[model samples]
Target: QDWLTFQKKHITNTRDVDCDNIMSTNLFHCKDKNTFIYSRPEPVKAICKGIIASKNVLTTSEFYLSDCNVTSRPCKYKLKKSTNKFCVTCENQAPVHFVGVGSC
Candidate 1:
């Protein structure tokens, strides 16, 4: 799936926060730019880039194996975490970001 590019709308209830309408920075990019389009970015918020300080990884979706800084979806992610390169994968740990699919 592709990362979403929508503005976050906060609701009264915490659970009411819709993840779809939200955005994420974690991403997995396609080397073939022709097959994939570089995800657009939001104005106020920034995408996570699957990393913290270094921000070396480039993912397309948040469903792969880490935390979704913004939106938090299963198969989707945000441009902040997404990228257009594969050689920029983040390390195996971060302050706010998790690593290696810890849910298992």
Candidate 2:
């Protein structure tokens, strides 16, 4: 699925907090606000089959992620690191969208 690939490039990052460059990518430009997950795609995708917390949203188990918000016209981003349960929208058995942290 496209989401699987998208997550791999834009969401999944198991190492350091390289938000400035990572978030500057094209995928991040698709939205003003974004979160980069410091983990593999499997865990995120697994939430697809988990219980639906609300609407089409599902809660993920607590994990490390970086919250990034564009701060300037040249795409300057302010990043904050946090470990929490993420709220996401799943489709085709994969997480396709990030809603926010905690409950949707």
Candidate 3:
């Protein structure tokens, strides 16, 4: 949490953000619990300033899904991505932080 605070503080204007502490447990549990997303999109829009050309934004970019959401799930998560499925735990991403791995 402190690291993120330090990095963001000297970085730019901060706003409603996901608490880093909570997100560690479940990163993709529907809605963000920690809100680590940091700096609302509204601020970013203000920073850009001026009327950004739409054509330029569209024409320049190709294959938008590349860098966006690039992080792939574990072998089990990607049920369709691969063939010959042989899952170990049958879970994707491992719940971000699987503390109860073997606990009973």
Predicted structure with the largest lDDT when compared to the true one: 2
User: What TM-score does prediction 3 earn?
Assistant: 0.19
lDDT of 3 by residue, 29-92 (tens): 3222211212333332232234333211111111111001112432112111111111111112
Tell me how many clashing residue pairs each candidate has: 21, 0, 4
Clashing pairs in 2: none
Per-model TM-score versus the true fold? 0.18, 0.71, 0.19
Candidate 2 lDDT, 33-92, residue by residue in tens = 677777777766777864444335646468887776777655666777888887776776
By summed lDDT, the worst window of 10 consecutive residues in model 1 runs over 4-13
Residue 30 in model 2: lDDT: 34
Model 2 poorest ten-residue lDDT run: 51-60
CA deviation > 4 Å runs, candidate 2: 8-10, 50-55
Which structure among the candidates has the greatest TM-score? Answer: 2
TM-score: the better of candidates 1 and 2: 2
Q: What lDDT score goes with residue 38 in model 1?
A: 28
Q: Scored by Cα lDDT, where does model 3 land? A: 0.21
TM-score for candidate 2, residues paired by index: 0.71
Residue 95 accuracy (lDDT) in model 1: 18
